PDB file of C-alpha atoms (C1' of nucleotides) in Angstrom:
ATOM      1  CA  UNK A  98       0.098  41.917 -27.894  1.00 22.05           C
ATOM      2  CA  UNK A  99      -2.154  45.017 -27.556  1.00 21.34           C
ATOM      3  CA  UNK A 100      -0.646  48.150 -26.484  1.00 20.02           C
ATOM      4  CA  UNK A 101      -1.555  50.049 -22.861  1.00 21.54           C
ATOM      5  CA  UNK A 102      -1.189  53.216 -21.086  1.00 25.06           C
ATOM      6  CA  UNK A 103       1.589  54.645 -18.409  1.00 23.07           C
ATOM      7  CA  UNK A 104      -0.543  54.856 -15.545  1.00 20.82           C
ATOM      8  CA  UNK A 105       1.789  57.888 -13.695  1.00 23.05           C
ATOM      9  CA  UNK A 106       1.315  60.495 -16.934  1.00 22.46           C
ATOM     10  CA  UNK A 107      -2.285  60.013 -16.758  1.00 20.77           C
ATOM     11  CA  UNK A 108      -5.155  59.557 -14.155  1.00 23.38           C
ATOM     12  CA  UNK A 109      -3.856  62.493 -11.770  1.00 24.42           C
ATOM     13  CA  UNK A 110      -3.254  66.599 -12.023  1.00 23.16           C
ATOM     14  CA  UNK A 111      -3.089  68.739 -15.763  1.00 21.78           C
ATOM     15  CA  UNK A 112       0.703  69.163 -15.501  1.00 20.21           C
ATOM     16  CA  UNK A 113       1.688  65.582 -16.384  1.00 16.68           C
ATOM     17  CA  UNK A 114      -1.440  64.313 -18.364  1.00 17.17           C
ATOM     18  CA  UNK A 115      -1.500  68.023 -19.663  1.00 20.02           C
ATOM     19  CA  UNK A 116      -4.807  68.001 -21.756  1.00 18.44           C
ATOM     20  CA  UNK A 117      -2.606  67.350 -24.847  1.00 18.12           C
ATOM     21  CA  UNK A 118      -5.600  65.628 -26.167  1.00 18.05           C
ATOM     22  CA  UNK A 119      -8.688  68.150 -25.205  1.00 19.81           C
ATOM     23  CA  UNK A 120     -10.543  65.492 -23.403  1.00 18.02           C
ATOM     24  CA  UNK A 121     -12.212  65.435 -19.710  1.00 19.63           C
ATOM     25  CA  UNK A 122     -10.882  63.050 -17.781  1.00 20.13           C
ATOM     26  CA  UNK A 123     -13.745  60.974 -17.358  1.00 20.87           C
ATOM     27  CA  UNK A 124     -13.387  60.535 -21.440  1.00 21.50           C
ATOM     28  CA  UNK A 125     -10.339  58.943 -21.052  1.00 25.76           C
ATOM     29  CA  UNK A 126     -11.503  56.399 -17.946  1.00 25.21           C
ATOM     30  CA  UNK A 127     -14.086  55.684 -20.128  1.00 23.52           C
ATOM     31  CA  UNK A 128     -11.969  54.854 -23.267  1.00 23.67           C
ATOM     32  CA  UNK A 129      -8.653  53.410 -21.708  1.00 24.87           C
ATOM     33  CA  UNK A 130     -10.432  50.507 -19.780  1.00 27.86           C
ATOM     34  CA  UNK A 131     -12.869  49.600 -22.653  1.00 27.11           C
ATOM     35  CA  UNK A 132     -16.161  51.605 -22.030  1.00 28.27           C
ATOM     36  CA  UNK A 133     -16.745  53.610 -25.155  1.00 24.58           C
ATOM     37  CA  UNK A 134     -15.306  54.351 -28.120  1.00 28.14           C
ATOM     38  CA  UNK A 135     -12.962  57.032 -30.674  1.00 29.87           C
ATOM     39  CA  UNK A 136     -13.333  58.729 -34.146  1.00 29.46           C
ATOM     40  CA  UNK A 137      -9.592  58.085 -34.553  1.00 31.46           C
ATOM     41  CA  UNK A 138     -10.292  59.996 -37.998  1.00 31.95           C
ATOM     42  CA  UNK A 139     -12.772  60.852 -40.451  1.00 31.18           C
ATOM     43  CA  UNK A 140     -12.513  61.500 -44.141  1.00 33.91           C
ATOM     44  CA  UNK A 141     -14.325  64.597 -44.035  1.00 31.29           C
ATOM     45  CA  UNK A 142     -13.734  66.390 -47.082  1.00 32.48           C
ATOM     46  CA  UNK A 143     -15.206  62.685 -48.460  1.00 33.50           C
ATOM     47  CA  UNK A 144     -18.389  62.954 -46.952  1.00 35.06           C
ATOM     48  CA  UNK A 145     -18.669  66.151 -47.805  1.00 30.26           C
ATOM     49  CA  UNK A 146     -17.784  65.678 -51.318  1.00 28.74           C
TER      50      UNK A 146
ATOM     51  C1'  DC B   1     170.607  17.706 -26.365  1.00 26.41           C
ATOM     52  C1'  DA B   2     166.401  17.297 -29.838  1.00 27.50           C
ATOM     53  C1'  DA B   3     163.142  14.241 -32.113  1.00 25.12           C
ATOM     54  C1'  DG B   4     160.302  10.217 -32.009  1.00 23.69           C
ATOM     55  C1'  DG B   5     157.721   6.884 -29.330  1.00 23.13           C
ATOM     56  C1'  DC B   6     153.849   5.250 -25.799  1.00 24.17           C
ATOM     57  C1'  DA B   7     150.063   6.318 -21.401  1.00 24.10           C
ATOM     58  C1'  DC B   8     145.015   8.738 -19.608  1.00 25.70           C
ATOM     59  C1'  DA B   9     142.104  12.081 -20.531  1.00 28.61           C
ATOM     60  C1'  DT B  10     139.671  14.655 -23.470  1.00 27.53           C
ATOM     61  C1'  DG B  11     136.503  17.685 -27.058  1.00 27.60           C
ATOM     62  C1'  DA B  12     133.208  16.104 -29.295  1.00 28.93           C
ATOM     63  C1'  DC B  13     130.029  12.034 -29.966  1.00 25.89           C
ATOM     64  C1'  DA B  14     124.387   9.230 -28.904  1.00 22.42           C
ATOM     65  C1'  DA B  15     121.683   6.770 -26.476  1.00 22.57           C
ATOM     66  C1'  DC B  16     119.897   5.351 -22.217  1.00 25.39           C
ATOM     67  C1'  DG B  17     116.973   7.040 -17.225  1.00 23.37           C
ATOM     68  C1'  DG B  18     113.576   8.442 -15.424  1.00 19.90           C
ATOM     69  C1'  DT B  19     110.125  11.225 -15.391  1.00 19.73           C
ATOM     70  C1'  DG B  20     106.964  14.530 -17.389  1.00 19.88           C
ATOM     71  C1'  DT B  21     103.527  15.692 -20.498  1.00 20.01           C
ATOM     72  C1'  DT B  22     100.283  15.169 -25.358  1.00 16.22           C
ATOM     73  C1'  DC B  23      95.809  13.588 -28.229  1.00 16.45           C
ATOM     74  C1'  DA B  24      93.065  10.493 -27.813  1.00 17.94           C
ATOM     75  C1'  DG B  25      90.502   6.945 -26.599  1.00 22.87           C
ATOM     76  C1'  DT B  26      87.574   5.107 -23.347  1.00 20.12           C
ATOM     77  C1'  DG B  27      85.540   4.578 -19.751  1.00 16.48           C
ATOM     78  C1'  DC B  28      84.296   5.357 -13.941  1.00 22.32           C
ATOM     79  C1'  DC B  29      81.956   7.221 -11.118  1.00 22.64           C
ATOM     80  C1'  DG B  30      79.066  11.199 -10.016  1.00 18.81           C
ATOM     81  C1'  DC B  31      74.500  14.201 -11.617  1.00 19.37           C
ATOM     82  C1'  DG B  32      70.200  14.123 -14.388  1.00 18.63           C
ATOM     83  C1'  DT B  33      66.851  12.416 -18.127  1.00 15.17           C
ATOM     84  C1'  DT B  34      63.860   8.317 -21.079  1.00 14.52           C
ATOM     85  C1'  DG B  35      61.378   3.987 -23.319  1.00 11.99           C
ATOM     86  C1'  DC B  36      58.348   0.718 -21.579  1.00 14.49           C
ATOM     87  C1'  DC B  37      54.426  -1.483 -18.179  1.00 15.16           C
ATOM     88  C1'  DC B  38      50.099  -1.085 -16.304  1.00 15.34           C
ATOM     89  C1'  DG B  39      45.838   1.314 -13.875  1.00 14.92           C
ATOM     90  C1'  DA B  40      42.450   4.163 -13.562  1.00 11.15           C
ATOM     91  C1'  DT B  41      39.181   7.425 -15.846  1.00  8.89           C
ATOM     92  C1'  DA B  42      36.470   9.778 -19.113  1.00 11.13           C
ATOM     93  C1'  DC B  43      32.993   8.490 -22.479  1.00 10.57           C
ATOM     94  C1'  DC B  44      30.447   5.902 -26.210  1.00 12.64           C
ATOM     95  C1'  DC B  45      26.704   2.290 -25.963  1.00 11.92           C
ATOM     96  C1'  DC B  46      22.237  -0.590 -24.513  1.00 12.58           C
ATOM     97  C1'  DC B  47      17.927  -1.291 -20.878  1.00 15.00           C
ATOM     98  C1'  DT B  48      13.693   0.530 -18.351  1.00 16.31           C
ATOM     99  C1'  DA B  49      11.519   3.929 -14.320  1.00 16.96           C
ATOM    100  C1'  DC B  50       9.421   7.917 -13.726  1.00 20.24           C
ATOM    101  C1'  DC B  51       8.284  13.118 -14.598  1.00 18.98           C
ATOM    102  C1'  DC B  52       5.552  15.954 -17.097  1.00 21.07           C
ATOM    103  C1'  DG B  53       2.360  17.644 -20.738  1.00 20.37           C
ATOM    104  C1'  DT B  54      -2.067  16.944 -23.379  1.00 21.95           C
ATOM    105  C1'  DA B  55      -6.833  15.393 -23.905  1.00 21.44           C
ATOM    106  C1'  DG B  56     -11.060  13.578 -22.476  1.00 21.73           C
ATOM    107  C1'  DT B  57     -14.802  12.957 -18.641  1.00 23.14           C
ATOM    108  C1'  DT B  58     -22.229  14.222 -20.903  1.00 26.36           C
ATOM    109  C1'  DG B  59     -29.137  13.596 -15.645  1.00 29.42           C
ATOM    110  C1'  DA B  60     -29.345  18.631 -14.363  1.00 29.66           C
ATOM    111  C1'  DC B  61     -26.407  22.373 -12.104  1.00 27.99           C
ATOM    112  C1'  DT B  62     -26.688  30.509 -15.713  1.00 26.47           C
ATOM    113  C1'  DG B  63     -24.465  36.916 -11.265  1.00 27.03           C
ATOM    114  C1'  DG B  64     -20.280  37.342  -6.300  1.00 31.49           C
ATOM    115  C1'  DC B  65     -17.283  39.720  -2.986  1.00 30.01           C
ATOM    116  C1'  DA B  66     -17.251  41.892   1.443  1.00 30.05           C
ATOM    117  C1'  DT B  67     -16.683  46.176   1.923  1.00 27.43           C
ATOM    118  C1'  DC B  68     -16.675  51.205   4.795  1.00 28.43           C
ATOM    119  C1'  DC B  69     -16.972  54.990   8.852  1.00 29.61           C
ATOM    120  C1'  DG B  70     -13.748  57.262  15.855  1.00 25.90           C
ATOM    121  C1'  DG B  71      -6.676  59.364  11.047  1.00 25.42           C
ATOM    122  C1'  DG B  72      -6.346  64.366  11.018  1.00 24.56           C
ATOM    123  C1'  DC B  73      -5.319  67.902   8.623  1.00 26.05           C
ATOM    124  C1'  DG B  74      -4.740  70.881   5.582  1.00 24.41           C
ATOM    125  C1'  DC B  75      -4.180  72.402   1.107  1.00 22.27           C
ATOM    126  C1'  DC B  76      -4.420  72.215  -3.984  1.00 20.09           C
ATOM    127  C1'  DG B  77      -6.780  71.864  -7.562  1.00 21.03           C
ATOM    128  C1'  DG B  78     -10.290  70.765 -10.524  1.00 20.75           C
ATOM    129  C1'  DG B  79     -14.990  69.562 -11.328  1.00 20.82           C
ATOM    130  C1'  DT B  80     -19.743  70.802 -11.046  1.00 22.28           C
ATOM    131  C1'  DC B  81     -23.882  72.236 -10.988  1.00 23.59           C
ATOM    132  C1'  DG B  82     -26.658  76.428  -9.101  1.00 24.34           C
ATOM    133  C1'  DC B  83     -27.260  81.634 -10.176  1.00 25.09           C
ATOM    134  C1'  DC B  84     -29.165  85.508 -11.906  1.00 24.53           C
TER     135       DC B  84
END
DNA sequence: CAAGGCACATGACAACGGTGTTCAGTGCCGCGTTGCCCGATACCCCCTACCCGTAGTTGACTGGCATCCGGGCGCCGGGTCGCC
């Protein structure tokens, strides 16, 4: 019902998880397993406007 | 002595003898195929017995669990906060 992670490409060394999102690891622990939350995306250019 | 007369046999003449063949008809015994008759067997019904899922039960009752060390051994590799 809710989508979930592959546990082997992340939570171990930078050549499989690979920093392709520029986050520490603990960022992810902490957002995976429902401890804090995203800006998925912001309208900018609206808020500035 | 030659011609004309009578006996026995003779060229054919069919029809019996006896036996072999012809269409045909019908069976006579051999081999194989068929309607019955039942008998069992799959397949509908009704009845209720029991398995299994759902929904209540109101004194009060509001944060646990036991971890874990005598590897051992080294490296990678990254994180992580001091350092000046």
């Amino acid at each position: 019902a809710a989508p979930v992670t592959h546990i082997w490409y992340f939570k171990g060394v930078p050549s499989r998880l690979g920093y392709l999102l520029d986050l520490a690891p603990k960022d992810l622990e902490k957002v995976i397993y429902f401890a804090a939350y995203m800006i998925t995306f912001v309208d900018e250019e609206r808020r500035t406007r």
